[PDB]
Structure 1
Amino acid sequence: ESFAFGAVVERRDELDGRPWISYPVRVVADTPELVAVHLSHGTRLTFGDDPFSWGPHPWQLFGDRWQSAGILQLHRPGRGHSVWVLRDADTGAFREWYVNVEAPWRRTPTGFSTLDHEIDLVVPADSRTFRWKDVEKFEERARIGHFSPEEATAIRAEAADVAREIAAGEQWWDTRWSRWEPPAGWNALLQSFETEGS
């Protein structure tokens, strides 16, 4: 099973057995080596009903549309992260690679499902160095039970693996993706994934 290039699919974070946040993305690649999807500026965000074990998804500060520059997400099937191509909202300049540690993506009839795992890594565009992010925030959340011990050990190992890869110059992703730009017609997507009535 695969999705076609340009298909509009759901990108979901699933928490407590239900959608936490979901938003439509366009498919750029759906291959055994790469799932690449695009979240465009102005796209509608769907949030699940409270309460969640983790509280409301933090993108709820933007209300119900993605206000910033579009995000290309690059995923190597089976890995416990994806890599986001982040650009400057004002200039469109490529700024950084944002490694979002999260559950390996699951294919669903509607798209892909994952779940944020708090630890992030950031590689600036110049590729001089990289930084770990939110490790202690992660650990506090693991201590209060947001992650089980088995989950938290998997998360720590995944983040360590990616950091070791980057530091060895063996980052899996093709950095030429930093020059990709969406087709001109790839604008805001307005699809809601809400299931009213519950």
Structure 2
Amino acid sequence: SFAFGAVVERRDELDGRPWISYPVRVVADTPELVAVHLSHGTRLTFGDDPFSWGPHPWQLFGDRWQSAGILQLHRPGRGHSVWVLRDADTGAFREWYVNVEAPWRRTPTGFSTLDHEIDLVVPADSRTFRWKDVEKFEERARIGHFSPEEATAIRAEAADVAREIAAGEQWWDTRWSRWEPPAGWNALLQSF
């Protein structure tokens, strides 16, 4: 288990290799929570083409994290994480972003996952949320980016969190939306 402020890899692994990989700072690493911090300016490392799913979509923006920094929150065993998203101009908390993805696994350099296209967008202090990229996911399932078993399990995952949020029973502490990084927790440029 990793120390507070340790710099580790967070990777989306596709085709047996890193589709994207970037350095993050550990905020928590416990049996109930893995939280990590992706800082504004951090270098994003993309694997070389071709991938079965095309270039990672974040190459549109280039090879740094352009927005405000984010906290990723992840409950071990579960098929998503929750991102704390802030306004890049004002720094104000805008929303919870639920990224549906493979349950994270620990690697010798940090953690590995894979985005599973389905996303939930939750306004501050709200049980109403917006489904994002559902139809995009279903098309990608149709053409075989995910097998039927995987697609079944992604939809179940996503429906699970959607119900908890709408019930007002979000697994995570909502005080994370006001958490502030220590000073000097700035851009990280290393590549794994």
Q: Normalised by the shorter chain, which TM-score bucket?
A: over 0.9
Query: Separation in 1 of the partners of 2:153 and 2:128?
Result: 24
Query: Separation in 2 of the partners of 1:126 and 1:177?
Result: 12
Instruction: Confirm or deny that 1:180 pairs with 2:174.
Output: no
Query: Separation in 1 of the partners of 2:183 and 2:35?
Result: 18
Query: Separation in 2 of the partners of 1:183 and 1:26?
Result: 11
Query: Separation in 1 of the partners of 2:55 and 2:102?
Result: 18
TM-score using structure 1 length: 0.96
Runs of 4+ in 1 over 3 A off after TM superposition: none
Query: Separation in 2 of the partners of 1:44 and 1:5?
Result: 21
Provide the secondary structure at the position in 2 that maps to 1:9: strand
Q: Where does the alignment leave 5 or more consecutive residues of structure 2 unmatched?
A: none
Q: Where does the alignment leave 5 or more consecutive residues of structure 1 unmatched?
A: 194-198
Provide the secondary structure at the position in 1 that maps to 2:181: coil
Provide the secondary structure at the position in 2 that maps to 1:177: helix
Query: Separation in 1 of the partners of 2:90 and 2:159?
Result: 33
User: Does the 8 A contact of 2:127 with 2:168 survive in 1?
Assistant: no
Provide the secondary structure at the position in 1 that maps to 2:128: coil
1:169 CA drift (Å): 1.3
Of stretches 159-168 and 126-135 in structure 1, the one that deviates more from structure 2 is 126-135
1:185 CA drift (Å): 1.3
Query: Separation in 1 of the partners of 2:15 and 2:127?
Result: 39
Query: Separation in 2 of the partners of 1:112 and 1:121?
Result: 22
TM-score using structure 2 length: 0.99
2:52 maps to 53
1:128 CA drift (Å): 4.9
Cα deviation 1:20-71 (Å, max 9, x = unaligned): 0000000000000000000000000100010001000011112111111001
1:126 CA drift (Å): 3.2
How many equivalent pairs are there? 192
Provide the secondary structure at the position in 1 that maps to 2:175: helix
Query: Separation in 2 of the partners of 1:165 and 1:64?
Result: 35
Query: Separation in 1 of the partners of 2:39 and 2:170?
Result: 25
User: Does the 8 A contact of 2:127 with 2:166 survive in 1?
Assistant: no
1:140 maps to 139
Query: Separation in 2 of the partners of 1:24 and 1:84?
Result: 16
Query: Separation in 2 of the partners of 1:141 and 1:68?
Result: 27
User: Does the 8 A contact of 2:80 with 2:101 survive in 1?
Assistant: yes
User: Kindly tell me: are residues 172 and 128 of structure 1, through their superposed partners in 2, closer, same or farther at Cα, counting changes over 3 Å?
Assistant: closer
User: Does the 8 A contact of 2:106 with 2:112 survive in 1?
Assistant: yes
Percent of aligned pairs with the same amino acid: 100
User: Does the 8 A contact of 2:127 with 2:165 survive in 1?
Assistant: no
1:188 CA drift (Å): 0.3
Query: Separation in 2 of the partners of 1:128 and 1:18?
Result: 37
Provide the secondary structure at the position in 1 that maps to 2:72: strand
Query: Separation in 2 of the partners of 1:181 and 1:136?
Result: 35
Query: Separation in 1 of the partners of 2:93 and 2:125?
Result: 10
User: Does the 8 A contact of 2:75 with 2:81 survive in 1?
Assistant: yes
